Structures are given as C-alpha cells and as structure tokens.
Subunit: 314 residues, 3 copies
C-alpha cells in the first residue's frame, strides 16, 4: 500500500508522559525500513511538533482540554493532508485522545468512512460521564453525531464537528467499560464484540461479522484505531491502562490481516504504547515488537507468506 | 443476585494445609465489598468452625475420613440454611472434598438441581479406586446415586445419601483423569467436555451444549462447583494439583458469564485456592484475583459492561 | 501401538550443535517407560551412530551437504527396517533435515503414505532458493516429485528419489515462510493451514479438513513430521528457530490426539528440540516435557482419560 506516516508525540490525554516516546521507539524498531521491505510506498511526514499550552486548567473534571484539543486539531489537518495525497495515514501516536483528530481529518476527505476500534475500552465517556477526567477515554464521544448536544463546549474543541454515526463503528476487544459508557452503547445501538463475543464466536466469525456489518451496504474507506491495550498485557505490557484477558497476539494479527485483505484500509492509529511503563527492557521490546507486527499486517505482511509477481523457481 | 457467603477453611481432604486460608485471602481481596458494588444483596454466614478430630486413622487407604465427613456434614447444614433463606450459597472453600456437603445440603432444599463441575479432574474415585487416598479426589463418587453399593461404609459419611444421578452432571476442563475414573465416566454415561472437546468445539459451543444438556427438559437450579485447578496454572498457580493445558482466564469468565445469564445459578463452590503454594507473592495475588473475577462473573459482572436502570446521559 | 524408537543425534542441517542431544534428554525424561505405561509395545533401535565427514565443503551456498545427505541415507535404511518389522517408526531427532531420510525410508515400504508437517516453517527451500544454506529448511524440496529437475545434484543426496507428490502433504502451523517457498506453495498447490487459518477455523476444523484432505479418497499410512518450533516458544523455547504466535500446548495435543484416533499413524518425527538453547533449566524441562506429551498423545494418551478393557468397579 501507499503509506503516509505521521508521528504524534502527545500524552496530555492521560497522566503518564512516556507515551510521547511512541513514535521514537517504533521508528527505532525499523518500522519504515520494514514497510519498504514490502510492496510499500512510504512517505514520512515526521513528528508533529506539539507546542506547550502552559495555561490549561481543567474544564470541570476534564484535564488538559486545550492541549488535547489543539493536538487533535493539528493532527486532523496533517491527516487530511496525507489523505489528499492518495496515501493511507499511519498515525504513530501517544494517547488515544488523538483519535479525535485522526478520524476527524480522515472524514473531511472521506466522509463515508467506517471505523473499527480495537481496544479494551470503549473510550466513549462524555465530559459529563467521565470519572477520571482523562480525555483518552472520551475520544469517541466527541466524534459521534448522535451525541452532539450532550457534549459541553469544552475549551480547545470548538473546531470539532461530529463526523461519524453510531452505525459506522464497531468495537473489538472490550473488557473494561464504564457504566455510563455501557448505557451509551445499548442506547445508541453501537455494534461491538467484547471479549465475551470473541470467546463465543471466535475471531474468525467476529471479523466476518465486523466487515459485513460495515461494508455490507457498500464498500467504503476503513479507519482502524488500534489501542495496544486491546491486546493482552502478556503481549503489550508497556501501556497505561492494561486489562487482563485480552486479545491474543494471533487474534491481533488476524484482525489486521483481514483488514488488509479488504483493500479498504485508509486510516490507521497505533496508540498507547508507553516504553516508560515496561517493568523490564524486555517488556518494552515485547510491546514495541508486537505493535510493529500489527502495523506490518495492516499493510500486507501475511503469516502464510508473501512473494513478488516473479518466477522464483525460474 | 442474593448471595449467602459461607467460609469453609478445611484442608483434610488432601495433604497440603494452606488451602484452609482460602476464605481469608478471598475476603481480603475485597470479595464482599465487590459483590455489593454490584446489584448484589450479600449476607455473610462467616467461616464454619471445623473442630479437630484427633483420632482419625485411615479407613483402608482413605485419609482423614472422619474429619472430612464431619466437615461436609457441617457444611451441608449451613448450605441448606442459606438456601432456605432464598439465597445463592457461595462456598469459599478449602479442598474439593467439601463439595460432598455443599451439593448434599443444596439438594435437600432443591432435589432437582443440576451440577456443572469445572475441574482438571473428575474427582470421582471411589474409596476403592483411589490410589492417593485423598478425599478431594472422590467427592463425586459419594454423591452419585448410581454408585451407591460401590462405596464402602467409610467412617464419617453415614449421613450421606447420594443426591444426584449421573445424568444431572456435566464436567468441563478435564485433562488428568485416572483409569478407574475414566471407566466410571463411560460406564455411567456421564456427560463431559475434556480439554479435547473444548479445543474441538470452542468454549462457546461447549457452554451451549452443557446448558442445553442440563436444562433442555426443564429449567432447574444449577450448582457450579469450580475447582481453580480447572484453569491453566498460568492463571491459578497457587493450587495443590496443577495440570498444564488448562482453561484460559477468558474461558473461565465465559463459562461463568453464561451461567449467570441463565438466572438459574443457586449454588457455587470456589475451591482449592492455596496461597501457601505460590512460588512468589505475585502468583498468590494472580490466583486470588482470578478466583475473585470468576466469582463476580457468576453474579452479573459482564465484560461488555454493566449499567443501572437509569438514564446516564439524562 | 507398536513402536520402534530410533534416536538420531544429528545437527549438521543447521548451525547450533546442541540439537544432537535430543534423543538423550527425551529418553532421560522417561519416554520409553511412559510409552510402555500405555498399551504400547516398544522396541528401541538405539541411536544411529553418525560418523564425521571431515571433508564437507559447501556446495554453492548449501552447508554440510555430504554430512546431511549421509545422515538421511542412514536414517532411511533404519526407518525402512522398523517398518518392515510392523512397527510405527519414532524418530527422536536432531534437526529437521533428517525428515528427508525418515520420509524416504518410510515411503520405500509404504509408497502411498500421506504427510502431515507441523512446523512454523515450510522447510521447502531448494538449494537455489535458500538464503541461509541450512539444509533443515530444505527437506521438503528433496522429497517432492514435482520439484525434481529443480534440485541440483548436491553431494550426498544422489541416493534420493522424490517419494511424495505435492498433493500428499499438509502443513499446519506456518508463520515464517520465505518468498520462494511461498511461490512454491501456491504454484504446486500445496495444502496448508498457516496460523491465519488456525485462527479463522479453529484447530478442530483444521484437523477435520486435514484428515479429510489426505484420507478422503482412501485410507493410507500417515507420516507426522513434528518440528517443535511449530508450537509457540512459550511451550517449546529450547529450539533453534523460534517464532512467536505459535500453536498452543492444547492445539499441539489436539492435533496428535486426532492423528492417533485415525489408527493410521505409521511414521513420526520429533525434531529440533535443543536443550542447549534454554535460557534456564526450566525452559529446557518445559521444552522436553511438551515434546514428550506430544509424543505420548500420538500413541493413545487422551486428555479425557484412558482405561483397560477390564471392570474397574468389579
Ligand atoms: N474508561 C477509563 C479508561 C479509558 C482508557 C483510555 B484508552 O483506552 O485510550 O486507553 C476512563 O475513562 O478513564
Ligand atoms: N485424581 C487424583 C487427583 C484429584 C485432585 C482432586 B481435586 O480436583 O479436587 O483437586 C486423586 O484422586 O488423588
Ligand atoms: N526458512 C529458514 C528457516 C527454516 C527453519 C528450518 B526448521 O523448520 O527445520 O527449523 C531457512 O531456510 O533457513
Ligand atoms: Ni484502551
Ligand atoms: Ni483507547
Ligand atoms: Ni482438580
Ligand atoms: Ni477438584
Ligand atoms: Ni520450523
Ligand atoms: Ni522444520
């Protein structure tokens, strides 16, 4: 595929600051080189320089709103830029709050996009239902059209315009959903496959249904927002909000291999990788290596193997 | 649900004594508080005080028969008490021999009960087929109606009256069954899903069949006897008889989430958790935390989330 | 079953030399005693004495060709010997290059054999497509009838005569296939179930299809070549070419339990176990114990249990 890499070293959507190193550790693992080692056309747009917003007091319970709102507004512009360039945007992120800007900018160019959100969490708390105040657990609430009128005017997000309907998104991997978030899921009728469904159906049927659900009516661009805590912490331990009983390494690769095979991937987010949280140097490399593997699968790397359109035996 | 907690610090059904700490470590993990944090009405009946039976020599090969028989006779009375109180009995146990009293007392009030036994073992050795002499590996033999006449009059169990037919029980998780036990399984035609069946069908179909098998003819109270060694030792390491290749954390939660959803759970046993056997302080907390998670799922905690019957967005 | 054990302490098919200890550590774990503990008739043909071929310079890129070719030629003769004795050959090996001789000797007596290759790799590189030069990653290329004319005359293999068609083999567990190997797979139309297929279908359906694929037309002898790196390194860490996201312990036992149940197993290879590569004494015992478990399942050991044709209750 044709990829446009965007580094987004941002962490103000949650407490821990090490998430800002995501772009760096991922690049160091040879992500660019590896993508090119495939049938991939890669153009790196660099790391977006996020300026400090020294004066950013909480809005009610919500923390660092102006900093988060500015980082997403900026990211939205860059993403829309790479999309206008006929490239699949690859956002190497910090925290998941950046999804607000990534999906927003993606939808400007492709308003008909469908979203696949792999995460242990729904991240759909409103500024009024959140208990932590961390914006990385509220991105979806700002993007849903049906929730407009329920989201207060939070400083830093006046530029936001809900771009996706509750019907254009599917969750995969849920295992720690807040009560208000659960109420929102059932009320707006959002499609999801919690770990319970994955256990019941198998990742195979889950992906069959997910894609059918989003592309049955018509093929449309796909945005995959992958939070690394969606995978079990035995695979991605260096992350801020780990939850046991997650998707396996294999299921992670299955999801992405299937997404790739649709040929419809147009936007990708690799989020919440925080090297600073590894209990050992190995947990860091384990988290980074898994994050990279997931990324490569999104762009063609298949476990059964790959080969060029040439005669290898000759 | 409406729960009646019963602590049963007993270990004479096997060699290791640390199993007697089960009720304590589980309570310390905040089990009561956590259940109440749900739509749960909790009444704790305390820890049953098991008196010492100093004079308890083996009956043939069977060890501590009078001590085990007395502990089960006592537990049976308490369980029947909580059942008469319209509450689901939750037996925080020591070793699995206590299942004799738990199921017995449960059946006094609800003679039509069906049993789901999650375990790596069948625990159906008779006093004559057992090679270890440990009674925690023989509870089922004392409960089956079809085995009466094959169980000798063992000191301490004259109060026992087989309350369940081979047709009212289903095993899930088997991977270390003795030859005589296997002979009993095939001969009495007991329904089971060994790890081989779980691998073949998937935990989803396994639960579909298990519940259909026990409730197809008519809905009836369900007794879930959960031996923590049914789960893989990577999840519940602090237990006396671990066996590799066990049920996963996810499968453990799936089984219980499905049981809960039947609305028919009326008796639950959480057994064999032995803190003293953890190779590290973390293996102990890992075993206890998993045991607690399984318990909460039996009473409504769902991985997709939970919410009260109120308007969260208002 | 009736087993003929053959120890093959050979490692020249790859760089690391510790693989030569496979037969020793497996025997020390009590493999013979354990098989006999079952309804197994065991005859050990000892460890084949592989003489040193001091003068063995590379053939182009291929390493230790004469040593590897001689070790396989020798093994082929022994395997054919045990087969003529009405016994299932059990090759406790070193590296996977020995599969050349094992399958060759097996096919002399049973030309209609079908092959099941459990491995993370296809091991089908030709002397011309290999990049490593290690012959343990090329055994299949020497055995396929359809590849004859594409394999150069490599010193030490003039005795080789392709004995299996691309249609008589099934791969299970693939996750690291080279480009040329992938080209060969799709070109010769070889049937395989990479980790992607296992994830999609489940090991249950995978085995249903595998056996149906090989025995649908007619029942025929089965040769199972099991490379321990086919299993995840969390189960078999002491091996030379580990690859994450492998088959689970359970899936490993499922495959073999199903193979056993066909009653058609006639040739088995347990390869690539290298004690010298364990990062700890426990990783070695973990690798060896798993390798043994897989072996026992091939010969009847079932997770649901086993019993003799006698009355256990009497
Ligand atoms: N639901 C919690 C945790 C959200 C976790 C955010 B995430 O998924 O981006 O890591 C909260 O609102 O603070
Ligand atoms: N079958 C063995 C082990 C039984 C294990 C008992 B259990 O399941 O309660 O831990 C025995 O009879 O000693
Ligand atoms: N494909 C690689 C690795 C092969 C691994 C060989 B095996 O499967 O026997 O361990 C190579 O040709 O060197
Ligand atoms: Ni998350
Ligand atoms: Ni998230
Ligand atoms: Ni058990
Ligand atoms: Ni038990
Ligand atoms: Ni291999
Ligand atoms: Ni191999």
């Amino acid at each position: 595929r044709t990829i446009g890499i965007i580094g987004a070293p941002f962490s103000k959507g949650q407490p821990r600051g090490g998430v800002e190193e995501g772009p760096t550790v991922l690049r160091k693992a040879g992500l660019l080189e590896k993508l090119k080692e495939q049938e991939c056309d890669v153009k790196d747009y660099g790391d977006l320089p996020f300026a400090d917003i020294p004066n950013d007091s909480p809005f009610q319970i919500v923390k660092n709103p102006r900093s988060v709102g500015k980082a997403s507004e900026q990211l939205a512009g860059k993403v829309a830029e790479v999309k206008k360039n006929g490239r699949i945007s690859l956002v190497l992120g910090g925290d998941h709050s950046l999804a607000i800007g990534s999906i927003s900018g993606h939808a400007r160019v492709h308003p008909d996009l469908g979203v696949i959100w792999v995460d242990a969490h729904t991240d759909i708390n409103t500024p009024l239902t959140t208990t932590s105040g961390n914006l990385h657990g509220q991105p979806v609430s700002f993007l849903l059209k049906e929730l407009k009128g329920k989201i207060p005017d939070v400083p830093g997000f006046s530029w936001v315009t809900p771009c996706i309907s509750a019907k254009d998104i599917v969750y995969i991997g849920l295992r720690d959903v807040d009560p208000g978030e659960h109420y929102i899921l059932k009320t707006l009728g959002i499609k999801y496959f919690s770990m319970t469904e994955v256990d019941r159906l198998g990742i195979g049927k889950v992906m069959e249904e997910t894609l059918s659900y989003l592309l049955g009516r018509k093929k449309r661009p796909i945005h995959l927002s992958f939070d690394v805590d969606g995978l079990d912490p035995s695979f991605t331990p260096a992350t801020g909000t780990p939850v046991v009983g997650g998707l396996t390494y294999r299921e992670g690769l299955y999801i992405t291999e299937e997404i790739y095979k649709t040929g419809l991937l147009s936007g990708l987010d690799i989020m919440e990788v925080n090297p600073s949280l590894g209990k050992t140097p190995e947990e860091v490399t384990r988290t980074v290596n898994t994050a990279v593997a997931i990324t490569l699968a999104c762009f063609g790397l298949a476990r059964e193997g790959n080969h060029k359109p040439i005669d290898y035996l000759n």
